[PDB]
Structures are given as C-alpha cells and as structure tokens.
Amino acid sequence: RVLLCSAGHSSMVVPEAFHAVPEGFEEVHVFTTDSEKFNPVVLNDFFHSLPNVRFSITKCHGLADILNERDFEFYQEMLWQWYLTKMPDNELPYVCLSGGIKSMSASLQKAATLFGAQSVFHVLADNNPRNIEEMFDALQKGQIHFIEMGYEPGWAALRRLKKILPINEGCSRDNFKPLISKSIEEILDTGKSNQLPFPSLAILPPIAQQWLQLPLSANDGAWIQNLPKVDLHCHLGGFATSGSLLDQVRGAASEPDLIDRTFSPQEIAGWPRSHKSISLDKYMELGNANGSKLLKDKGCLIRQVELLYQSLVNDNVAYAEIRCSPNNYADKNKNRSAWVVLQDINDTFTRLITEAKQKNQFYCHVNLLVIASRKFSGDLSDISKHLALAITAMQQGEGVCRIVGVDLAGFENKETRASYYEHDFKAVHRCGLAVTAHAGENDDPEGIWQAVYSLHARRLGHALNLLEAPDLMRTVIERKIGVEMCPYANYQIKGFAPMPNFSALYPLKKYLEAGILVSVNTDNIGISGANLSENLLILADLCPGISRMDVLTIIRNSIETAFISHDFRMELLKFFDRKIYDVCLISIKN
Amino acid sequence: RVLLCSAGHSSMVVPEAFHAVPEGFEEVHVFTTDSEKFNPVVLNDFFHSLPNVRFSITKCHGLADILNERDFEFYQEMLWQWYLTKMPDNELPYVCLSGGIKSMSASLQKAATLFGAQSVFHVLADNNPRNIEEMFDALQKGQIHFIEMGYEPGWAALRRLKKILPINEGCSRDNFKPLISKSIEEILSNVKIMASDTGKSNQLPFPSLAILPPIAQQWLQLPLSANDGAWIQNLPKVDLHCHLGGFATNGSKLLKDKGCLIRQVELLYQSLVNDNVAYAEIRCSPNNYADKNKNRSAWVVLQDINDTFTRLITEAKQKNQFYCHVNLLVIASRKFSGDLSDISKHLALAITAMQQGEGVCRIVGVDLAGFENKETRASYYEHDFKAVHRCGLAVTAHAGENDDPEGIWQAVYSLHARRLGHALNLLEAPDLMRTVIERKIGVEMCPYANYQLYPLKKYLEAGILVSVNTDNIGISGANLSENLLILADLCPGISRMDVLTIIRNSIETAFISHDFRMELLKFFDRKIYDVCLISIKN
C-alpha cells in the first residue's frame, strides 16, 4: 500500500502513522511545503532501516508556507497534481493529517474526499514525543491514539485526469485549469431536483449528482456513447444505404447477377449536417439504392438484419423496436409471401438474441413493428392484409423477438387524419396489440385528436407543430402519450437552429419542460447517416441549455412508452438502472 | 446567512470572519469545548456593540480537550449535533475553519462536506491581533486575508437528520447515543453495498428513497404487522375517491341550507388533515343540493363549495402548517329514466365550473357513478361525452361490481376513462388485464367497501396502478389509515413496500397538472423519507 502525509512543525509524524496498521505499510510518499521546520534527514534515517519500504520525498518548491490567496491556490494545484500522480493505479492511497497547519491539512482533506483514499486518520500522542526513544514508549504505553473518523471512498472514478491532463511534476500556477472549480461553482429549480430517474442516481457523490445537471456539451461523446440507449422508431429498409454496409448486403445476395451496382445517391454537403433544408421527396430518393428493390433476396434480407442487429449492439443500445414492411419484400414468384418474410425475420432475430445471450455478452432485446403504409396508388385492401398479418404474428405466441403492435404512416399529401383508415382499426385492440401513428408531420393540429381519441394510438411520430395547440398539449400530457421524434431527420427535412436563414426553434426543450413523454429516435439510419448516439448528441447545438439529466429522463420516458409487458419492464428497468449507474460512475471519470 | 466556527484557545477567528464578507452576517454561532482556557467576554462585548445581528455560544459539556478515541468521537458527535441544530432551514451557511487545533478543523471540514455549506473559508492574520481596536486597525491596513475553499453542496438526504434528534436535552455519557455515527455508517454501507454487490445493487425500484440505512430497507421488505398503525398513520396519504355527502351519516334531506354545507366542508377538511393526507379528490352532487325556492342553484352550491375549500386551503397555507390540497369531481348520478337531461346538465355544469380558473381548488374531472345495469352501460351515455374530452376534462367510472367485462372494455375505450372504480373480478378476463395494464388505467378500490379472497395482491403483482380509497368515510365508519390497516390480516404476506407502491400509484393516477404532480412528488418524497427515518428507531 501507499501512504501520503503532510506536516508542518512536527518532523516525524510519518513514523507514528507507519504503525497505524499492525501488519505494517509498504510505500511512503510525503509532500509538504518548502519550510525548514520539517526535517528530511530524520525521516531518511528512519526509512533507511527498512529498505523494503519505498521512501520518496517531494517538497513544494518556491513556497515556504501559505501566506495569501495566490500561495494557497498555487499549493493547492501542486498538491492536486502530486495526488493524481502518486496514487496507486487500482488502490486508493492511504493518507494522514496529524501534521500541518490548517491550510494544507484542509486542502489535502478536500482532495482526499474528492478523489478518494483507502483510509484518512489522525495520530495524536499524550506526551507529544520529540525523539524516537520517546514515541516508542508512547505507543508501548498506548498513549498514542489512532484517531480515525471513517472510510473515505470519494469518487470511485475520477483519476482519468492523470492521463487526460499530462503528468507535469515541474510547473507553476501560471498554467492550470481547475475543471473542478467549474464543476463546483454552480450547483444549487424543482425539476432537476425531483425529475431524477433511475433511483441509484441518488447514490453517486454530490460531485456527480450535480455534474449531471450541467448543460450538455459537444465534447460529451464517449459518455453519451457509453449510456444504454433505446430506439423506438427505426425503419429497417433505411439501415444500409451506401458504403461498406451496401457492399456487404449486395455481396450476400443469392443471385448477384440482378444487383444494380450502377445507381448511386448524390452527396449532400456536410451530411448529416445539411447545409440547407431538404424536401421529403429527395429524402426518400437518397434511400433509393436500398429498400424493397434490393431486399427481395432472402440472403440480402438475412445480411441486412444481421448487420442492423450488430450495429445496434455496437451503439450500446439495450432495447429497440423495428418498423418493418413485410408485404413490400414479398415475391410470389419465389414463393416468398409476406408472412414467410416476417417469420424469417422473427427467427433470425430470435437466433441472434439467443446466441448473444448464451455467451453472456451485451444484447439489445428487439421487437418488431409492422407498417400499414398509406398505400400509394390506391389498393387500400393491403391495409387489412397488414392488420391480419400482424394479428397472426401476435397470436403466434412462442418465441422471444415478439411483435408488439402496428404502425400507420405515409405521405401527408393524401390528407389522411386517421379517419380514412379508421374503418378497420377497431379489431386490432381486441387482440391486444398497440397502435402508433405518424401524424401531423406538417399537417393541421386537428387530425391528432382523432388519432389519439378514436385510434387509441399510444405513440405519435414527429408532431413537431404541437406547440401551437396548447389544448392538444394538455390532453396529450394527461393521457401519458409518447412522442417519437427524430432530431437529425427533422433537422434535415425541415430546418432548425442554428443553420442560416431560419428562425424556427426545435421544440424539444419546451416539450420536456411541459412533460410530454418524448422519446428520441433515429428513423432511417443510413439515409440520415447518424446513429442514436449522434442524434442524442446533436441536441447540444440543436436545443441550447439542455443538461445531461434531461437526456437521462428522455431515456426513462423511452422505457415508459414502450409497448412491453410489466415484468419485462421491471427487469429492463433494473438492468438499465445498474448499467447507467456504472456508466455515470466510470465513463465521466475524465 | 449564518456563520459557524470552532473556538479553541484564542478569539482570532470570529470577528475577522464576521467582517470578512463585505455585507456582513446576521447570525453567528461558535462551538467550543469545556476548556476554561477560552474566554467569551471579548466576543460577547463585540457582538453587543452590534446587537442587530445574532450570536450564540455552544459548549461541549464534560470535555475540556481530546485525549483518546472516546474523547474525539464524543467531540465530533457534539460538533455535528451543534451543526445540525444550526443549519438554516433553506439556504446553506458559511463556515470558517481557522479555529482550534487541526483536529477540530478537520472535523468541521468533514461536517461541511457531509452536510453541505454555502462558502467555507479560512482566515489568517500575520500579527496575531488581540483586542478589538487593533483587529479593526489591521483590517484597515489590509492585513486581513480570507482563504475561500469552495462551495460544498453536500448530501441532500443527509440534511434531513434534524427530524430524528435536534437535541437530546443535554444527553449525558450514561444515556449517550451515536446517532450521527448511525448516519455516517448507513451512508457508507449504502455506498459500499452499491460498489460491492450487483444483485442487490440493481433492484432499486422507487422514488430515490434508496438512501435509508440498509436496516431500514430490510425492515421495509418485511411484511406488514398489525402493530404498524402509528407508522401508517404518520405516512402522508392520498384519497382519490371520497364522497362529501356521506361524511356525517344527511345529504338531500338535511344539506339544502348553506350553513350546514359550510360546517360539513370544514368537518371533512379537519378530518382529512387529521389523517395527515396531503391530497384528495372529492365527488359531489350539486343538483342534489340545489334549492330553487331559496334561489339556490346547483352552480351556486358548487361555487360555494369551491370558495370555502380554497379559503380553507389559503388559511392553512398562511399558517405554514401541513395542509391538504383538494380538488372536486362533479358526479353524474345515473338516474336512468328520470330527467334524462340531468346527465347533460351535470356535464355542462362541470365544463362551465372548471373554467373559473382562479382558485387553488378547482374541478379536474367528472364521475359516472350511479345505478349500474346492462342498459346503463357506457354505450348509452356515449352520445354526450364527445365534448368532455374536447374541453380537456377527465372522466372516471364505476363498473365491474355487478356489470359485465365488455362493459368495462367499452368504458375504457369509448369513454376513454383515465381511471376506473372497483372492478374486482378483473382476474377472470386476462385479456382485460392486459388492456388495463398497457394503457396504465388506474383502479380505485376501497377494501372496506368490498369487505362490507381479496385479489389486490395479485393486482400489484400484475401491475395495476391500484389506489386504495375511503369511498364514503361516514357510512363505512373508517378512515384511509384504517383501510390500509385491514390489508395486513385481510391479505396475508403483504410487505411494507407495497404500501408505498399503492401511495405512488395513487399519486400517479390523480387528475393533476404536470407541475403540480412534480411538487406533490417532491413533498411526498421528503415526507416519507423523514417519517421512515424517524420510525425505524422506534
């Protein structure tokens, strides 16, 4: 073990602390001011009798004693740097405070309680011995007291500053940034006080408990990636659109002869950070290289599903729901019916889940979503076909990758407000499925009312114009209705701050403070060119002033709004709680 | 602003610390041991020179100095106790550390880190001044120096130990108890359990009261005993279903006048506060109480109810004493054939009444109670509810006691009832269980009402947001604390955790605004924390 000490007038308190553990101590490292009242020769001869005990001596060069604010802050930053440098890599260092005047003793105590120490304590003797032949009988008589106030874990993970900040033993106060000063300066609203999800978030030391409340920044990439996230609006057809993913899915086709390798979607400057707003038609056009024209192949379908699952696992996602269009990928020529396609995707996902779980690795439990599209070019019987297919998949029953519900989506040019397609949606609720609705992407605030009150839809897509219907806000809020929303996709197809020639503000922050159960999603990964992590991170320059804890409550809302069973909700909540606790403990160790 | 400092052998710290802040302070408290070396006369006269600010001296009885482990632990306990009796109620205080020898300096810094402080600092003087005039002189020359440390927020949950013991009327060594040691050991054990185990580490399913001692959590996991009556009485509660007219059992025959209604409302409020209930929703019958011959319309009666309730709420709040926010629900008695327009009248009255706006008490929803029958199903009144949801109201229902499961289904889906009354036989339709589960439709079930095997346990296992209510206090002759008490013997194997789950489900199913729900969550969390932390000792 390694012990640390600081003393003033007293010269050999370190030997007194060296008997704190009856077994003994292994390493000794003492840091103190440049005052001459400390005697290094006595400590040297004391520790020379024990060669097996390492004895390293360091002093505050250029500072005999603390006298003013500048001297105090200089000594504080140097002892901080020495403390980060000198602790054991995996063990908390030992430390004692039986010596030194108030300033350095308090500074070392605060540094120890902020980083952590194996045991801080005090050693006092009744007879205040001056020579070793005195403290020998002082400890023999028991006069020396081993004053210990309690174990001090500190922040179990903060020492990343040892590496992210280069170790510089020789330096002055002229160049140092106290990140801790910024993390302490502003700590203490009702919301951030009591919207704490994941009850274990009350357990982290007050440093982390308040750090979670700081505004989110673009430099938060590793931490946001290391969180377990949830995606609820993902289109499988838009996963692979270009690049290595497209090459891999194309090469896995059963018959590569009929693979159109000539088409190539055009580039958008700065994509995904579009230099200007884009229309919906071109947004679908960028996904023309994939979709249904290429995914008819069974091998292509298997490769796409496996690649999507692998990417979802790589993005640290723990639960997801996938929107699929089984009818679009059916082909009667090869006896590839829509039901067969859905069954194959179910078996593939179940096999992937089982093989990931059997190895006790990280896996994202995945459930499907069927798409009852607007059915362009008429032929609305496919709506009933899709509902029947979903119902059959739902009472299929056995398995793990279950179908949870249906999705209604499509173009808003037809002006469908959940009334045209209401004539058949009555039967689905009897079985026990769940209904979403892509409503009001750019339409009037009227259709959503029937979408929630006649369709009984528990989720909404986008609905970015909800801010102008406060009456709709109130009824949405009381009914606990989730709102799926895609940051990058909406930003690209509509335009929001801060790109030039636009004044529209992203309604996310007001949606959160209102209390709408909004869950951030990614829509089409390949076309947008951004995974869940990037979509979450873009909120920094999308909605300024947002804090990490709003992200945490967004994740909690995403858990809440998923069409899943109760017991699975408890288990997933427990796993998310533990994982997120470890993440905020260890990842932000920076 | 409050200054706290330790007194050793010299009067150096206190005046320089008091004048260190340019604005100055208002309350200053200094802690010291039983040592006769220190003198209080200088500080006494200095603070008497400025009597506008407050000052006090606390002496650690029976301890002149620290000479062993027992002496130091006793001093630390009394220092922590003096600190906790001396937090300002809301704001964090300032701390000066330069007093005493390094031992009490470190103890005071530990106290500041543990309980949080506004801005702790150090004070040093080169010339070691002695008497007031030359302290002032040295401060004139700028020899004074304040060494600011930082701003510790501290453990928010650990500022709540003032409730268990402000002071033990000057405890002696014979009856001394290390309560602050209990606090520090509970928090360190919680952190160590978090860091060591994983199975216990991840469960944590509740509002972040995880910071109780592990012994407290183990006691909570234990099943209810019939002797926990004091504990449940002390816990804040919520009564989402209470009928005003059935308290003094009355109603149509007696309450036609005005003074009787006022005294009934006051009695209901007094009884409701008497049980420490923080929130309740009341269903009333304005048409049953109107008197046309006296020019007493139903609207007038409802306005009088709202006015007396909000007046009482304001009166209770002005005293800063514990008060119970109450909202009103307009009943729609299912009178069937008689005066079929009464239903439309009641809903229209509700829409008009909820729009009054100003008033802490308001109308948040309507009720569908009345004579239940197949003809009285939800598919009979549904022509009239196309607009109650349009104006943003809320609807409850009472079905399942003798009705049919498809009636419950249509009530859930046609009326879009946010809540539900009774429906004890919901087990026999697992499909209905799933429908009520995923839609998060609450259930209001009163154990005494059905008492006059109970499946509530199975309801918690499945996941119904079950709320326990009084229905009608008077005819049942029991309050909500009694209702919670019957669950012990009435349902064996019920754990004290499920009582808190019932309370939480009740506060989620209340027809309340988002911000009001947020405030109620915070207040409920603080109150349950305090009450369990107090009651675990006894």
Ligand SMILES: [Mg+2]
């Ligand atoms: Mg979409």
Ligand SMILES: [Mg+2]
């Ligand atoms: Mg009742």
